[PDB]
Symmetry: C3
């Protein structure tokens, strides 16, 4: 009736599994003869045995646990009654009920990625999205600069595991992430770590700045003029779309002369700043000289910028298709590319005085009365110098005598307008008449006057009509109808019938005489 | 003298209170007959009893703790000596001193709020301010997209509690936060959680971009001209204030013609970019044509922008109140809106030659000598064609004979200036004199000349004065004072007293003769 | 053979050292008479002793540990067999082997610093770099606003220690950091803290915005003209470098008139916006009027901006060194700063008609035939009014008779060009000839005409040549060669030899007569 009742059945109160060790909580013992414990483990197909001599300890910590497996543990006590052999056999020794414990998996990375919002401008925070799927309580994460050969590892986040671990403040450059970890145990000193695990491939952080797209739908137009001077205004309009790249910042409008691009390309070209309205204007655009127009979509990134330009689009303003042209405000001196002129506004009669036209070289002055001419207007085309009138004239240098533009029917002459050779009026006419080819002339009326034609003259008037300043040896014939004188130193005579001035000047020349010597019929009558 | 001394008094070494369970540390036992422990709890007004059979365990973990209350716990041991009845009575059984333990409150949220700095431009980090006021050691925080019906919860921060928990990197969109938690215990396996606690109302994250305010205090001014051509320069100045909205970015100056706004509104309008100086300029502004001016305060936000405009303010430059006008640099061809002219600079005498004025239509040429006229200046107003002098004249087409502008006192005439009909000078005068209504004329001196008046003539001169080219039947009277001839074929005679040229041409016509037949007194003297 | 074998040797299973307390794990006891433990500690040169009465406890927690030292601990048990004296002596009492434990150092700060990327624009996250080098598991970090006298401390990060602790979201203003900490122990209730440790000197957070540098390498140039009107175009180019300050944002080009800066400085000055191309252009620049040009490098910071300007650089365009000048497009009215003119293009002959030059005051009209003159061109310089021809002339006001510009050798005269006094031609000549100083004249041919010289006349022609309208008292001499009449009322006579018209008019005046009374030789012949 003497026996050694074996120590009571073994129970396992609590199990806490580390990565490579499990801390197991058990019950108390008896039998006064115990030596230790004999723990059996079921790996799934193979079994192992361990021994823990010394009983003062109140819990056990198995080690050398094969990674990633659920084990079944068997508790037990043994005394000197049962030897090592029977312990191997496990008969007579009490054993625990079957309990299986899970090994917490190592910290596993499942996704690493950099991301932020599409950067518009300025400096923005780039976030780091690293995803882990293990289990621990003191996980550690480290980064290393991939660029250089040596890079003392750097640890940035230490804490509990998460499906997605995100933290900012990382530098942009190359950095690859390793993963570590530890698991705690109620026994204070013991602490189990995990093997380092680096991602197979590095990743690179960068700002989300992306070059934008160039503007499209370029359209042109212009306002014809300003008030005067024909200042032609050119406006540039275009549409820029959205959907790819970065949010474009402002623009820059660049253009150059057509004839200047050929000699040199897009250097020294005309450039102006642009607003956010997608349309800038040139207020005084050259006329008839073409131009190459380009619009640039300048972007802006946190570190620098980059520009995408539209395709070249040349255009020139001409007399075709202007709009918004209500700047024709008459000012009295209307300078235009097609003409420079001076006019005087009045009522509804735009009375114009001065003009120059670059279409026919016409030069006009003074108000118009002719169909297309004015008193002192001009026309170098089909040249003509046309003028009239002169309030003050105290001089000439050449005669201004002949009349031309018709060799025969503009008779060279200075005369009274409206009267000529053969008019009863008392007007005048002088010069070289050409309807007779020689000078005509007439001064005075048609009865008391002086007439002349190039060949001959007719002066049917007297004067007081022989006034004498010299001695005459008459080369013509001296005829007459009557004669009164004081004496006569003659040469040869004629007197048909001798009257006397005793009768001649006396009344009736056949009057009182005393002897009439008629030499015609033997007539000597003596009284 | 036989007794079972009850197990010694019970002490509670340490207490650690979880949310729903308290881990209590106790002392060791004796008496060889113990069964377990009998813990009494004082809720404040009601008591509960629990039993823990089995003594191998070294500490206890009460459960089912009513939330948010300080409990008084009573430790105890009991043996088979005292039954369940006496255990209920609690007499003879030793009891512990009175200790009260506090239950740590659940994780409580007290404030949730999004905030950052007022965004000027670019992408900025929006922070999330969530405030919790509980107590735990493994607090968890999760966000959920409020927008969609289904949103797999997301956990972002795991760590110790804090008065204010702030973490960035959250998306802008809708997100509401729940709160969880756990509390650890020295016993490894046990871990107590907390019930989920979602904020009653969601909150929405957004950038701190706010529309700015429009510019104010609009003021205009202009510089009158450029060097020449009267290029009028218009400047726009305005003041933009600060204190509300976002930090404005740049501006855009838009304006349109007055007469064009009526037909169409703020479309196809003139627009230019603006700087940060709050003032942009138009270098060649139209003259006398009004304009509607608006200045836009374009903002810029991280995702997009928005513009607040000022009120319309129309203005036109005129002859009133220009400034900074020191561009009057004479160049010799001064084109102006009020006149186009050409002048020659010299010393302090701005000698001007050419002119056209858009105030009176005046057209001027050549240097001035008259009060308001020049030799070939003009004035279509009160029209007059004024010219003088001609170095070369080889032609005319009409006579240029009459004189007008005074029908009577500008006598039609071409004559020597300074001499006329009745002057002793040897000058000339011709034409239709009108102070007598008919031609006056005089060629030569006052003694040997030819005079004429429209009616009659006076030629007091001779010629070699009867030169004869024809035969004369005299229709007047042929008088005379002396006569010399070679013969005479007469008709009737008169000879008072018969002298002879034997005496007449001979000296003393009463000289040598031989018989004088005087017919007056019977006088026949024969010698 | 009776003895009290002392309790077996003392072992120390595990040691966990707090800041001020160490939790030591030990073995179990025996001997039925124990009282407690006697722990000896080796500070390095001095020893201390402690006692722990009561054995129910299974581990010990020494306190009052001198900071920052490695201690050697000695375990022990004692029974009533050995008294306090022998316990002090430590003979007979069993003692433990020698174990030394390290005290974890307090949380030490080694570096505090604010840093971010150099801010270009917008709001950016400023990070806080605080470096700690201690050891704990619940480290705490707090910030305090240095500016104000009272600032309720704020705690922002709670977690494990790290070589460098970085967290964002801090306000910019003044903030100084303190450091705290705690260390956990397996015994649940006990928790050991650390003394507060504030950095000796505060630090201030600020954005990394820094003022940029002004632009350099300023260079000027211009395009001469537009199509017409001589619109001079001025371009401004400059280079801005990189390496210090912030990334400059855009620019602003400001300039003012030279003569206006003296009166007032850089106020009311001309200003235009600028693009990122570092070059803006003025399309119509004043000519010959200098200008002061400044280019501003406006920056942009998260809160506000700041501008650094370049040095003043004045320049004026003149006839020296323009470029890109291919805007000379003839239009027929070429307005220029040096001349305003109107010309008519044709073939390779740029036929020019109208002109005004601001170099010599020349005014030109009509096509040119002279070396430097045209029919109605002008030259107020060395003044001359030159004109010719008039298609219509119906009026004059002064004679236009005299000829001048040569007092003697431009004879005042209106005459037929190419003929004068002494030519056989039938032309004319009138006026005041000056080579004789008095009028010359001739009308008609050289045989039947009227000649005149200022003094005398020669009319070698007849008329039907004595036409009589009055009665003549001849004041000259009336000579003759022949006489025919009807009667004669004479005064005194002469008749040499009495013929008769009975013979005179009859043939042979010596013909049929009847008595010839010759008074010369006593000759009375009677028939």
């Amino acid at each position: 009736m003497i026996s050694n009742n074996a120590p009571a059945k073994m129970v396992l109160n609590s199990v806490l599994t580390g990565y490579t060790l499990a801390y197991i909580q058990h019950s108390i013992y008896s039998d006064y003869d115990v030596i230790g414990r004999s723990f059996w483990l079921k790996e799934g197909s193979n079994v192992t045995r361990r021994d823990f001599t010394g009983i003062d300890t109140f819990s056990v910590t198995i080690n050398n646990l094969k990674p990633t497996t659920t084990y079944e543990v068997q508790g037990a006590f043994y005394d000197s009654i049962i030897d090592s052999e029977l312990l191997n056999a496990q008969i007579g020794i009490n054993l625990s009920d079957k309990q299986t414990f899970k090994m917490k998996s190592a910290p596993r990375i499942t996704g690493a990625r950099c991301e932020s919002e599409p950067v518009d401008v300025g400096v923005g925070a780039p976030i780091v999205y690293i995803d882990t799927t293990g289990e621990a309580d003191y996980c550690t994460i480290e980064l290393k600069d991939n660029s250089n050969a040596n890079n003392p590892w750097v640890k940035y986040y230490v804490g509990a595991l998460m499906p997605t671990i995100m933290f900012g403040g990382v530098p942009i450059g190359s950095y690859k992430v390793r993963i570590s970890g530890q698991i705690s145990l109620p026994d204070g000193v013991t602490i189990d770590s995990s093997g380092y695990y680096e991602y197979p491939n590095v990743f690179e952080v960068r700002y989300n700045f992306v070059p934008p797209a160039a503007p499209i739908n370029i359209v042109f137009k212009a306002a014809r003029i300003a008030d005067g001077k024909e200042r032609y205004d050119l406006r540039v309009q275009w549409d820029w779309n959205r959907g790819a790249g970065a949010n474009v910042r402002e623009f820059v409008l660049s253009y150059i002369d057509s004839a200047e691009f050929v000699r040199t390309g897009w250097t020294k070209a005309q450039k102006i700043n642009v607003g956010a309205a997608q349309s800038a204007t040139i207020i005084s655009f050259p006329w008839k000289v073409e131009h190459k127009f380009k619009v640039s979509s300048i972007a802006w990134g946190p570190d620098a910028q980059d520009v995408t330009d539209s395709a070249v689009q040349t255009f020139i303003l001409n007399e075709s298709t202007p709009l918004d042209n209500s700047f024709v405000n008459e000012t009295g001196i209307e300078v235009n590319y097609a003409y420079i002129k001076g006019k005087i506004k009045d009522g509804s009669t735009w009375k114009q005085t001065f003009l120059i036209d670059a279409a026919t070289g016409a030069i006009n002055i003074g108000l118009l009365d002719a169909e297309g001419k004015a008193p002192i207007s001009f026309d170098p085309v089909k040249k003509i110098v046309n003028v009239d009138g002169s309030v003050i004239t105290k001089t000439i240098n050449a005669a201004n005598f002949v009349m031309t533009n018709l060799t025969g029917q503009d008779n060279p002459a200075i005369y009274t307008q409206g009267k000529t050779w053969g008019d009863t009026k008392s007007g005048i006419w002088m010069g070289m008449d050409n309807v007779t080819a020689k000078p005509k002339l007439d001064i005075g009326n048609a009865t008391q006057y002086i007439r002349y034609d190039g060949n001959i003259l007719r002066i049917s008037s007297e004067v007081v009509a022989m006034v004498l300043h010299g001695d005459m040896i008459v080369n013509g014939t001296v005829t007459a109808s009557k004669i009164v004188a004081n004496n006569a130193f003659l040469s040869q005579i004629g007197v048909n019938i001798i009257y006397d001035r005793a009768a001649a000047l006396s009344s009736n020349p056949e009057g009182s005489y005393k002897m009439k010597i008629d030499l015609q019929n033997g007539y000597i009558h003596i009284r």
